[PDB]
From Swiss-Prot:
Summary of the tissues where the protein is detected: Expressed in brain, heart, kidney, liver, pancreas, placenta and skeletal muscle.
Organism lineage string: Eukaryota, Metazoa, Chordata, Craniata, Vertebrata
Function as written in the Swiss-Prot or TrEMBL entry: May be required for DNA interstrand cross-link repair. Also required for checkpoint mediated cell cycle arrest in early prophase in response to mitotic spindle poisons. Possesses beta-lactamase activity, catalyzing the hydrolysis of penicillin G and nitrocefin. Exhibits no activity towards other beta-lactam antibiotic classes including cephalosporins (cefotaxime) and carbapenems (imipenem).
Quaternary data: Binds constitutively to TP53BP1. Binds CDC27, which is itself a component of the anaphase promoting complex (APC). Binds PIAS1.
The gene coding this protein: DCLRE1A
UniProt induction comment: During mitosis. The mRNA encoding this protein contains an internal ribosome entry site (IRES) in its 5'-UTR. This 5'-UTR generally suppresses translation while specifically promoting expression during mitosis, when cap-dependent translation may be impaired.
Protein's recorded name: DNA cross-link repair 1A protein
Species: Homo sapiens
Similarity section: Belongs to the DNA repair metallo-beta-lactamase (DRMBL) family.
Protein location: Nucleus
Effect of residue 295 to A: Impaired nuclear focus formation, reduced interaction with PIAS and increased sensitivity to cisplatin
Amino acid sequence: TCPFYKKIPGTGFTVDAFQYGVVEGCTAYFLTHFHSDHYAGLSKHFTFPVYCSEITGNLLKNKLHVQEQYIHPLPLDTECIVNGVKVVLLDANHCPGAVMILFYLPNGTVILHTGDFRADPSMERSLLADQKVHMLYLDTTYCSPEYTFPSQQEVIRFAINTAFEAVTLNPHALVVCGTYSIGKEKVFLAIADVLGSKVGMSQEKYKTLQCLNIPEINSLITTDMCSSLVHLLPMMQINFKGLQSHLKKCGGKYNQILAFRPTGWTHSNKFTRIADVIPQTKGNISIYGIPYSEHSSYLEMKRFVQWLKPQKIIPTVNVGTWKSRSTMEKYFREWKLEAGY
Ligand code: NI
């Protein structure tokens, strides 16, 4: 049974609610982005209308084989009428195709659902700026002050410099990058670009990347592993055993691997600066954990909400424990008292 925080009151609409069978009274299913916890339940046999971004729509058609007649893509930043209700999709600064949704209820209530997002000051000059929002359904993944991490730019600067240094010292080093979903493609694209290489990967992963409307992508990726010195592998293979084994397969083309694991937050963020990150090393294999986040830090979240001044906040993440729920409610009250809404 669908939880309340996936339902939009005064509408026939649900958000990210495909794993509960037929939801009673749902005339339109919204999908914010193509991550498995959110799409869980969709397949080629799904027969209700789905509303989503153009990029999410390409992934549904090609990867899950949802039939075209049930896929309803909408443009960003554009007022649209769905089942007699005005909606806008806004960029969520998460993974490709991820959106926030504005719902203009027939009784005058305005509702923002962030999906998953990384709040940014640029959102303060989207179509959000033009009217009041009464309720906010908020991605609260990292809603606690211990969650700090650098900007995406700083992390990408660290990665490029690390990779370029290593491969200039040893032209026979291979760079490997882990992945398990869409997102964070800048990591491996930036590295391949500084090295003058294409990124090599499986056919399944090539196919996924072909769905994402990325400019000049045919210039950046390939299924020919032999011609590439940046390889993508499943995240589970990013460990000493997995990498040794992969190095065997390259035919003595390479004698060293440098591997990256983009995580989100990890506790070494409470002590160490990005500049000071060091890898774990076993022989000719080195492995870096890098804190590349596609979710808000605590401070980015707080700033967005204090700018938005919502009347009510409904968390969509960490909702399962009384301790999490009590923690979150305390921060929302702090923010309110400090900003005076
Ligand atoms: Ni996500």
